[PDB]
Amino acid sequence: YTVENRAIPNMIDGFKPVQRFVIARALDLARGNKDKFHKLASIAGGVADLGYHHGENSAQDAGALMANTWNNNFPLLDGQGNFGSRTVQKAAASRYIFARVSKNFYNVYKDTEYAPVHQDKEHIPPAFYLPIIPTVLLNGVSGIATGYATYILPHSVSSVKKAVLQALQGKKVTKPKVEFPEFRGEVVEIDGQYEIRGTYKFTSRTQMHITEIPYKYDRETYVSKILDPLENKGFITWDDACGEHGFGFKVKFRKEYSLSDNEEERHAKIMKDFGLIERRSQNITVINEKGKLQVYDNVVDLIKDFVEVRKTYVQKRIDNKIKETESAFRLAFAKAHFIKKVISGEIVVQGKTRKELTEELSKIDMYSSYVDKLVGMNIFHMTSDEAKKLAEEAKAKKEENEYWKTTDVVTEYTKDLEEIK
Amino acid sequence: YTVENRAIPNMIDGFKPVQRFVIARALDLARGNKDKFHKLASIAGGVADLGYHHGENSAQDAGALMANTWNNNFPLLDGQGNFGSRTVQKAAASRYIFARVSKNFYNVYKDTEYAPVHQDKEHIPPAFYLPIIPTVLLNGVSGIATGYATYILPHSVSSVKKAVLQALQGKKVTKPKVEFPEFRGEVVEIDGQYEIRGTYKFTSRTQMHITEIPYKYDRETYVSKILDPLENKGFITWDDACGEHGFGFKVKFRKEYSLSDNEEERHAKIMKDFGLIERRSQNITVINEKGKLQVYDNVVDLIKDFVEVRKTYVQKRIDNKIKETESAFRLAFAKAHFIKKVISGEIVVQGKTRKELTEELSKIDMYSSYVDKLVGMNIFHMTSDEAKKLAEEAKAKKEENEYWKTTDVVTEYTKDLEEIK
The whole-angstrom distance between residue B297's C-alpha and the CA centroid of its chain comes to 19
| Phi/psi-derived region of residue B233, left when phi > 0, alpha when psi is between -120 and 50, beta in every other case | alpha
Separation CA A220–CA A240 (nearest Å): 10
CB contact under 8 A, B382 and A349: yes
Task: Could you please state the CATH topology (level 3) that the domain comprising B322-407 is classified under.
Answer: Topoisomerase; domain 3 (1.10.268)
Alpha carbon distances (Å) from B189 to A17, A44, B279: 80, 69, 9
Radius of gyration of chain B (CA): 30
Sign of the alpha-carbon torsion through A35, A36, A41, A45: negative
DSSP state, B99?
E
Which of A377, A384, A385 is the closest to B379 by Cβ? A377
Query: A129, A115 in Cβ contact below 8 A?
Result: yes
Separation CA A360–CA A367 (nearest Å): 9
Phi and psi torsions of B14, nearest 5°: 85, 20
**Can you name the residues that pair with B279 across neighbouring β-strands?**
B195
CB contact under 8 A, A350 and B384: yes
DSSP state, B10?
B
- The terminus-to-terminus CA distance of chain A in angstroms comes to 40
CB contact under 8 A, B385 and A349: no
Q: Which residues of A touch B378 (CB under 8 A)?
A: 375-378
The whole-angstrom distance between residue B407's C-alpha and the CA centroid of its chain comes to 26
Separation CA B213–CA A38 (nearest Å): 62
Sign of the alpha-carbon torsion through B232, B236, B237, B238: negative
Separation CA B210–CA B185 (nearest Å): 10
State whether residue B214 is helix, strand or coil. coil
Separation CA B74–CA A106 (nearest Å): 63
Separation CA B264–CA B252 (nearest Å): 20
Query: B350, A380 in Cβ contact below 8 A?
Result: no
CA proximity to B76, closest of B1, B129, B144, B116 = B129
Separation CA A9–CA A5 (nearest Å): 8
Query: A334, A366 in Cβ contact below 8 A?
Result: yes
Separation CA A356–CA A349 (nearest Å): 9
State whether residue B187 is helix, strand or coil. strand
CA proximity to B156, closest of B148, B167, B146, B164 = B164
Which method was it determined by?
A: cryo-EM
DSSP state, B184?
-
Checking A198-203 for CB contacts under 8 A at 24+ apart, the result is A198/A247, A198/A276, A200/A270, A200/A271, A200/A274, A200/A276
Hey, which bits of A61-105 come out as E strands?
77-80, 98-101
State whether residue A225 is helix, strand or coil. helix
Q: Which residues of A touch B375 (CB under 8 A)?
A: 378-380
CA proximity to A229, closest of A217, A243, A241 = A217
Query: B134, B19 in Cβ contact below 8 A?
Result: no
Q: Does A146 touch chain B (CB under 8 A)?
A: no
Query: B106, B112 in Cβ contact below 8 A?
Result: no
Q: Which residues of A touch B353 (CB under 8 A)?
A: 383, 385
Q: Does A372 touch chain B (CB under 8 A)?
A: no
Alpha carbon distances (Å) from B383 to A238, B50, B335, B378: 96, 51, 11, 10
Which of A357, A379, A380 is the closest to B383 by Cβ? A357
CA proximity to A254, closest of A268, A276, A277, A273 = A273
Alpha carbon distances (Å) from B237 to A400, B93, B229, B253: 102, 35, 11, 6
Which of B377, B380, B383 is the closest to A352 by Cβ? B383
A233, burial (CB in 10 Å: exposed 0-12, middle 13-18, buried 19+): exposed
CATH architecture of A322-418: Orthogonal Bundle (1.10)
Domain positions in chain A = 2-177+282-297, 200-278, 322-418
When scoring A340, A347, A350 by the number of chain B Cβ atoms within 10 A, the one with the most, hence best to mutate, is: A350
Q: Which residues of B touch A350 (CB under 8 A)?
A: 342-345, 382-384
Helix axes A56-67, A40-50, angle to 10 degrees: 120
Q: Does B380 touch chain A (CB under 8 A)?
A: yes
**Can you name the residues that pair with B151 across neighbouring β-strands?**
B142
The whole-angstrom distance between residue A269's C-alpha and the CA centroid of its chain comes to 42
DSSP state, B268?
H
Q: Does A382 touch chain B (CB under 8 A)?
A: yes
Separation CA B274–CA B202 (nearest Å): 14
Task: Could you please state the CATH topology (level 3) that the domain comprising B200-273 is classified under.
Answer: Gyrase A; domain 2 (3.30.1360)
DSSP state, A239?
E
Sign of the alpha-carbon torsion through A318, A319, A324, A327: positive
CB contact under 8 A, A379 and B380: no
**Can you name the residues that pair with B209 across neighbouring β-strands?**
B201, B250
Q: Does B169 touch chain A (CB under 8 A)?
A: no
Alpha carbon distances (Å) from A172 to A156, A298, A304, B20, B272: 18, 13, 11, 80, 113
Separation CA A343–CA B336 (nearest Å): 23
Distance from CA of B399 to the nearest CA of A (A): 26
Q: Name residue B389's amino acid.
A: K
Query: B187, B195 in Cβ contact below 8 A?
Result: yes
Separation CA B310–CA B122 (nearest Å): 26
The residues near B399 (Cβ < 8 Å, ≥ 6 apart) are none
Q: Rounded to the nearest 5 degrees, what angle is found at the Cα of A105, between the Cα atoms of A99 and A106?
A: 120
Separation CA B290–CA B287 (nearest Å): 8
Q: Name residue A331's amino acid.
A: L
State whether residue B210 is helix, strand or coil. strand
Q: Does domain B2-154+286-297 fall into CATH 3.90.199.10?
A: yes
Which of A343, A375, A383 is the closest to B379 by Cβ? A375
Catalytic residue among A1, A52, A96, A296: A96
Separation CA B13–CA B20 (nearest Å): 8
CB contact under 8 A, A350 and B345: yes
Query: B179, B166 in Cβ contact below 8 A?
Result: no
When scoring B344, B347, B374, B382 by the number of chain A Cβ atoms within 10 A, the one with the most, hence best to mutate, is: B382
Separation CA B186–CA B271 (nearest Å): 13
The residues near A43 (Cβ < 8 Å, ≥ 6 apart) are A22, A25, A26, A29, A59, A63, A94, A99
The whole-angstrom distance between residue B24's C-alpha and the CA centroid of its chain comes to 12
A96 is catalytic: yes
Which of B343, B349, B383 is the closest to A382 by Cβ? B349
CATH architecture of A200-278: 2-Layer Sandwich (3.30)
Separation CA A197–CA A183 (nearest Å): 10
Q: Does A350 touch chain B (CB under 8 A)?
A: yes
Q: Does A377 touch chain B (CB under 8 A)?
A: yes
CA proximity to B125, closest of B1, B13, B287, B273 = B13
DSSP state, B243?
B
Query: B315, B409 in Cβ contact below 8 A?
Result: yes
Catalytic residue among B1, B52, B96, B194: B96
CB contact under 8 A, A353 and B382: no
Cβ neighbour number for residue A178 with a 10 Å cutoff: 21
CB contact under 8 A, A378 and B380: no
Radius of gyration of chain A (CA): 30
Separation CA A336–CA A387 (nearest Å): 5
DSSP state, B11?
S
Q: Rounded to the nearest 5 degrees, what angle is found at the Cα of A256, between the Cα atoms of A252 and A262?
A: 80
CA proximity to B154, closest of B224, B69, B252 = B69
CB contact under 8 A, B385 and A342: no
Domain A2-177+282-297 class in CATH: alpha beta
Distance from CA of B357 to the nearest CA of A (A): 10
